[model samples]
Target: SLFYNPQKMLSYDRILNFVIGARGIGKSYAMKVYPINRFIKYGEQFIYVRRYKPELAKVSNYFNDVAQEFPDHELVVKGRRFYIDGKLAGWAIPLSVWQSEKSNAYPNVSTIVFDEFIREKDNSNYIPNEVSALLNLMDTVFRNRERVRCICLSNAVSVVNPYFLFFNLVPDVNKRFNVYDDALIEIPDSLDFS
Candidate 1:
């Protein structure tokens, strides 16, 4: 595990949002590990959504192992299509498929984690374009429950991208003028992008 200093920031609780840094700075690793630990300890229903399919076949296996660490709740991915604990509980969904209206066919979900913001496409049929669809889905799923939290994780690329522009402008106009709390976590110097 990468060494993470929780004290580096105010507090994880105060981080109701997330804006990750560059690659190999442990952004993805931290996103997965932190929630897995918390979910296991508290039995909270957790779902991990990856923006792109990983090249390694063993990646799902790793997630399965992490799921086993949690008690009572089952951990399963769409690739496996089998229950982890002999009961249907957790699973993964491809971003492309989830963007389709067919996603409405599934049961209501609680938390929707966007593993990376950059992967969102500009196609009219894309999920991000149908914000109302997502809002309605969450409403249906968490009926009578508290507000659903949408956690988006990604590295800062450029403001020119339409997605980033939308996030920076129309949505976050009144506040800090950036996604989340305007808290841009910088990438560690060790990562050599060049």
Candidate 2:
């Protein structure tokens, strides 16, 4: 009766990659079970980054709520001293600001989770900058670390269309399905939400 089976989904030796359906399909919850829980249990560092302030708040809540499940571990919020297995590990900070503070706070995070990967309605005018930041972070910090992993969760919104175009070097590409490789996992359409 579990919503997701992490052991089965991540059984392979390859790196983990996922793409669940919109809001109600248990994407966030599944993330808690896989990378988050696994990291805490194994005493690994898990760093979550959000592009916007509101998204950061959501992640904070998720971490706090899930912390109770792991009695032996502790959750470290940004701007506070980090602790793992009741030992001081590092400090945390918010990446909400324009300047790159995360490069100093968590220089070597094991994983980075980007929640709700879609263009903000109000920031449509600044889409180019936002997209650039996302890519730049991936290329600069993520790409440099051999063990660094990126997990992006989002709805099937048109915001990702541009990324597909950039990848294929074509404008207004209609081949959305083909652009995504086998690593992208899709939820079963037959599952009734209603």
Candidate 3:
């Protein structure tokens, strides 16, 4: 209970999973771990996304810590692509550039880990039509596959952001346990120890 467990949200069988929580409670960590485990166990690939290039730029070495856990397969990132044992395992890209690169394809991507998807304060830099842009990118990645999952991680921002409003996600008064027709939303309360 001390850290965020994604099992609840991941069990919903929804293609899109949104998890909002306070900082450093391991939301981002869990998302990254899931994809690595999936790749090692099932040989599936993933896509790591951020809102802008600067944030995406830092991801080139983001998996170094977790890569230590898998000693059998070497994990490394080179020029925006993640490789396990020198084989392509994932791609890291930014939504800010999605519109210009929509023609590309990612048929092998089985999971999409979108980090810092919601802005805590700087709403001015949000991607235009972000929700839809994400959906379009989803279409491009999952083309003919249905066994894909997109896990969106973000800080505990307001529920009134575009994602909730666009999907009409209304949690109870406690702001927990909400669901959409095609999405699963989780707002964990364990970290609110004020």
Candidate 4:
């Protein structure tokens, strides 16, 4: 099995941690676990994001695997809200729709996990000007806050992906993580099947 330590990407202290790696290598799991840890330790909330609303609907079974490790502290998703031990820890939202709610605020959300930011081939559900849409979403949530961590995860995609072009990020596939501008990107080594 391939391995990736979430803390390695998080160590850079950047606001945006972008990861594009092979599938089923625990990338998304790391993102989920971070906010859970933050909530349990510091009482900080989190936001789970998808590119569209329909994608958010499929997150019902999200923490099934992780919940096995924490039997006593039930993790569950009720509608758009995620609860840990019956306490509201975060909310799930679609990035494409966040613009209409400009007056909304997420003062307590210290983490933003945007899963599957880079869609697979033939999946044309990407939002227009997505990179900027994401930045605007951050502005709505962060407002005057200074410590929100945003993590975006996806499977390996072409260098022509919007995030790459928008951020001018040229990831060194040889390195586990690359720090460019305000983001830390992880392009992990592909797993070997030979």
- Alpha-carbon TM-score of each model against the true structure: 0.54, 0.63, 0.88, 0.87
**Candidate 2 overall Cα lDDT vs. reference?**
0.46
lDDT per residue (tens digit) for residues 40-83 in model 3? 88888899988888887667677765766677878888988888
Per residue, candidate 2 scores C-alpha lDDT tens digits across 12-70 of 32222334444454565565545555455554455455556555554334546456666
How many Å off is the CA of 59 in candidate 3? 1.7
What's the CA error at residue 176 for candidate 2, in Å?
Answer: 13
Each prediction's Cα lDDT score?
Answer: 0.44, 0.46, 0.78, 0.77
* Error in Å for residue 176 of model 4: 2.2
Tens digits of per-residue lDDT for model 4 on 93-154? 88888776455556678899988888766665578888898888777676554667798888
Best by TM-score: 3
Error of 1 at 85 (Å): 5.1
lDDT per residue (tens digit) for residues 1-194 in model 1 = 25433334324322224444544445555555555554445434434555445522444574543454456656555562324445443445454444453344334344445555554334333445544443443354443444334455556533344444544533332332233453233233225447
Selected candidate, larger lDDT, 1 vs 2: 2
- Backbone collisions counted per model: 0, 1, 0, 0
Report the Cα lDDT for residue 188, model 3.
76
